Amino acid sequence: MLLQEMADEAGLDLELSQRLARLRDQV
Amino acid sequence: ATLKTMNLEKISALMDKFEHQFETLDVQTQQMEDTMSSTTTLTTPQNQVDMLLQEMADEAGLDLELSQRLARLRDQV
Amino acid sequence: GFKAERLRVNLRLVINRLKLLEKKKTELAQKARKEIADYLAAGKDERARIRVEHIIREDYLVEAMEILELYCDLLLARFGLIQSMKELDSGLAESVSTLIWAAPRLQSEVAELKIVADQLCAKYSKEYGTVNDRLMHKLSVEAPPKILVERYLIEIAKNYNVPYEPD
Amino acid sequence: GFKAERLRVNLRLVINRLKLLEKKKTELAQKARKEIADYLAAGKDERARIRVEHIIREDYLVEAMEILELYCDLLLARFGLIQSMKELDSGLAESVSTLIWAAPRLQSEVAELKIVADQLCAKYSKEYGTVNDRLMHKLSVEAPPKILVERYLIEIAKNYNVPYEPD
Amino acid sequence: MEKHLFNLKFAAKELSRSAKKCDKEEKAEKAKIEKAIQKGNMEVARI
Numbered sequence: 001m002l003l004q005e006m007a008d009e010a011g012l013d014l015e016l017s018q019r020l021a022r023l024r025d026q027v
Numbered sequence: 028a029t030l031k032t033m034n035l036e037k038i039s040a041l042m043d044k045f046e047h048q049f050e051t052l053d054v055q056t057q058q059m060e061d062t063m064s065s066t067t068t069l070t071t072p073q074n075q076v077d078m079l080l081q082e083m084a085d086e087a088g089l090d091l092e093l094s095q096r097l098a099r100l101r102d103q104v
Numbered sequence: 105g106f107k108a109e110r111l112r113v114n115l116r117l118v119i120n121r122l123k124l125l126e127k128k129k130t131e132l133a134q135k136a137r138k139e140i141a142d143y144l145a146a147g148k149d150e151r152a153r154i155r156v157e158h159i160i161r162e163d164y165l166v167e168a169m170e171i172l173e174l175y176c177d178l179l180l181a182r183f184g185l186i187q188s189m190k191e192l193d194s195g196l197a198e199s200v201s202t203l204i205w206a207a208p209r210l211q212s213e214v215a216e217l218k219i220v221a222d223q224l225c226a227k228y229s230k231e232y233g234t235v236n237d238r239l240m241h242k243l244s245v246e247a248p249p250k251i252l253v254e255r256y257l258i259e260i261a262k263n264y265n266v267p268y269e270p271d
Numbered sequence: 272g273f274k275a276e277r278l279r280v281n282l283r284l285v286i287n288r289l290k291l292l293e294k295k296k297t298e299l300a301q302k303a304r305k306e307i308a309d310y311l312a313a314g315k316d317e318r319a320r321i322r323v324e325h326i327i328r329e330d331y332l333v334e335a336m337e338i339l340e341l342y343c344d345l346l347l348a349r350f351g352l353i354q355s356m357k358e359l360d361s362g363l364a365e366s367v368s369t370l371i372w373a374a375p376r377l378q379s380e381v382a383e384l385k386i387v388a389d390q391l392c393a394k395y396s397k398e399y400g401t402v403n404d405r406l407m408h409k410l411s412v413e414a415p416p417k418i419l420v421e422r423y424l425i426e427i428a429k430n431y432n433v434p435y436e437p438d
Numbered sequence: 439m440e441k442h443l444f445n446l447k448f449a450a451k452e453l454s455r456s457a458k459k460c461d462k463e464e465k466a467e468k469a470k471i472e473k474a475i476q477k478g479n480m481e482v483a484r485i
Contacts, residue, residue: 003484006468010475011034050295054287068131073138093137093263094130097256101163104252151341157348245351247362 108187111223115176115183117216122173125213129166133159141264144257149268156256160248168242169214172206175199175236176220192228200224201234209243275354278390282343282350284383289340292380296333300326308431311424316435323423327415335409336381339373342366342403343387359395367391368401376410 007014064071084091136159143152178199179186185193192200207221225232254270261268303326310319345366346353352360359367374388392399421437428435474482 002471006471006483007475010472011031011037012475050288050291053291054284057287057291058283064135065132068128068135072131073134093259094133096259097163100252100255100259101160101167104249104255148337151337151344154341154344154348158344161348161351245355247349247352 106223106226108183111186111220111227112180112183114216114219114223115180118176118214118220119173119180121214121216122169122176126166126169126173129162129169133162133166136162137260138264140257140260141266144261144264144266144268149257152257152260153253156253156260157248160252160256164242168206168210168239171236171239171242172203172210172217175203179203186227192231198234198236200228202236202239204232205235206239206243273390273393275350278353278387278394279347279350281383281386281390282347285343285381285387286340286347288381288383289336289343293333293336293340296329296336300329300333303329304427305431307424307427308433311428311431311433311435316424319424319427320420323420323427324415327419327423331409335373335377335406338403338406338409339370339377339384342370346370353394359398365401365403367395369403369406371399372402373406373410 004014081091136155140152140155140159143149143155175198179196182193182196186196203217204221204224207217210217250271257268258270260266303322307319307322307326310316310322342365346363349360349363353363370384371388371391374384377384417438424435425437427433471483474480
């Protein structure tokens with residue numbers, strides 16, 4: 001996020017744990 | 028240099044933020060003036076301003092009670 | 105603890121604060137019936153009905169304040185009996201009971217009713233560990249009837265010469 | 272958590288913000304119907320149809336804002352019942368339900384509806400873990416009908432004295 | 439116990455000065471991020 005912020009400031013333009021936990025709970 | 032440090036997307040975001048902040052500031056000054064009127068309501072009665080406008084418009088030739096009735100009607104129901 | 109001079113001072117402050125609030129809120133009603141007439145002239149009717157509900161609540165509040173001013177002046181007149189006796193008089197029971205009742209209902213606009221009710225509860229803690237019904241109706245958090253609202257709109261339209269059509 | 276004074280302050284802020292947005296968007300509609308007439312005078316017709324779709328959406332948005340302003344003023348009138356009761360009144364259910372519904376639909380232009388809907392959900396979390404149909408139609412993300420667009424063009428052409436031919 | 443009290447107060451001052459110099463070096467490294475992105479060095483910017 002810090003690289004995204006300081007690249008958008010210069011104008012360059014370049015959750016998951018819950019999903020994988022529920023999928024481990026499934027199988 | 029200036030068009031890479033300030034893109035058209037950054038101009039668009041800056042201008043949307045400009046416009047929305049002046050919207051919020053106009054809401055601020057609206058409620059400010061509302062309080063500044065409500066604080067000094069006793070020095071500006073509405074009837075005196077109305078009759079004064081009627082007088083000074085009739086002088087220039089432009090040509091533009093209830094509390095008791097509503098109190099009795101609240102007494103009725 | 106009950107202090108008599110504190111109760112006398114705060115009753116006089118209640119009288120003065122209620123007089124100023126009566127004048128200010130009648131002037132605010134003068135200001136706002138004109139904008140209700142402006143909504144009626146613009147044609148929006150349910151908007152004017154809701155604004156009329158606001159102004160009916162404010163007028164009930166003004167009549168409630170003059171009832172409480174009457175009762176606080178009654179306590180200032182009978183303050184000798186208050187300071188003398190220890191048992192609550194029958195001529196004082198209505199006033200003391202409705203001021204203790206109406207002080208939480210009017211905590212925001214008159215902050216001295218809290219002190220007056222604390223002094224009256226400290227004076228009569230043996231009785232309280234009656235209330236005026238018209239005053240309870242005017243302090244009641246209840247929507248006014250629609251026929252009252254419509255009637256209110258009718259007289260606003262009559263004073264400001266705006267065509268309005270009821271239900 | 273529900274805080275009543277926060278909800279009252281944010282309802283007044285919603286009323287003020289919606290009044291300012293109504294004035295500003297009606298003025299923007301005044302500005303943009305002239306350029307729709309300019310496209311009709313230049314001869315481009317489908318371009319004017321798409322601009323008319325924009326202005327129809329803006330006019331539906333203005334009527335939606337006055338409906339929400341009516342409902343927020345209704346909550347400001349019945350705020351005593353809101354603060355008193357714990358069960359949702361039948362006269363309040365429509366207003367509370369459509370404000371909780373319309374607050375994600377109007378998150379961008381009125382940022383205080385998010386706070387108002389959070390306070391209403393915190394107040395009535397026991398009921399919500401109804402909505403006005405005309406208001407849902409005006410907030411609906413759906414293209415307006417072509418006959419409405421054509422009709423809209425006809426009155427723009429009539430006001431600005433431009434020859435236009437429908438379908 | 440006065441020697442250990444002096445050492446504990448000196449250790450608290452050393453930790454506070456370490457926090458100050460790290461908050462200064464954060465601003466220095468952010469200025470270096472800006473200069474590296476202006477030069478176009480993304481691996482230097484990530485470092």
